Amino acid sequence: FACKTANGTAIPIGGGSANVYVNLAPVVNVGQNLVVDLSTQIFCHNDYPETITDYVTLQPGSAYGGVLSNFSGTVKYSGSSYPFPTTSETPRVVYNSRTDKPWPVALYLTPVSSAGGVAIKAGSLIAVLILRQTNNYNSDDFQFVWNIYANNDVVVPTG
């Protein structure tokens, strides 16, 4: 399980935690508003698929940070939505190929205002995600943290 950002920046492997800088494009929707689609920003593969299959889950306690710290919403993880901040462990995503594919994650916000918005500055913290990596033929089982930072200035709609 080895990942990088769309800008080309490596993300640590093997249990190291990371500061991960991403571009975001928030959008207002009926119901949940999109904060960031990480599936356009973080790409991952498996460098040893013949010998091991990787499984990755999002752990409880994953949450917004910075100016979004007080907000709730949902996380779409591999085609299903779950409460955010997370209070349970998601099902597993499988990595079994050397070909980069998205980390299939998008973060949404529950409307709490009438037409409000929150400015996110480039360089500021968006979210703190806790990941857990396991595999099929081993007992290796470790957790690590991705601090998600904004690359660009945006307005997140809260209405």
Count of alpha carbons within 13 angstroms of residue 112, beta-carbon side: 11
Distance CA 156, CA 31 (A): 14
Residues in CB range of 26: below 8 A, 6 or more apart = 33, 34, 35, 36, 154, 155, 156, 157
- For residue 85, is the peptide bond before it cis, meaning its omega torsion is within 30 degrees of 0? yes
Q: Which amino acid is at 1?
A: F
Residues 1-159: name the CATH superfamily. Answer: Fimbrial-type adhesion domain (2.60.40.1090)
* Tokens standing for residue 57: 């889950």
Residues in CB range of 139: below 8 A, 6 or more apart = none
* Tokens standing for residue 3: 């990942």
Distance CA 139, CA 54 (A): 12
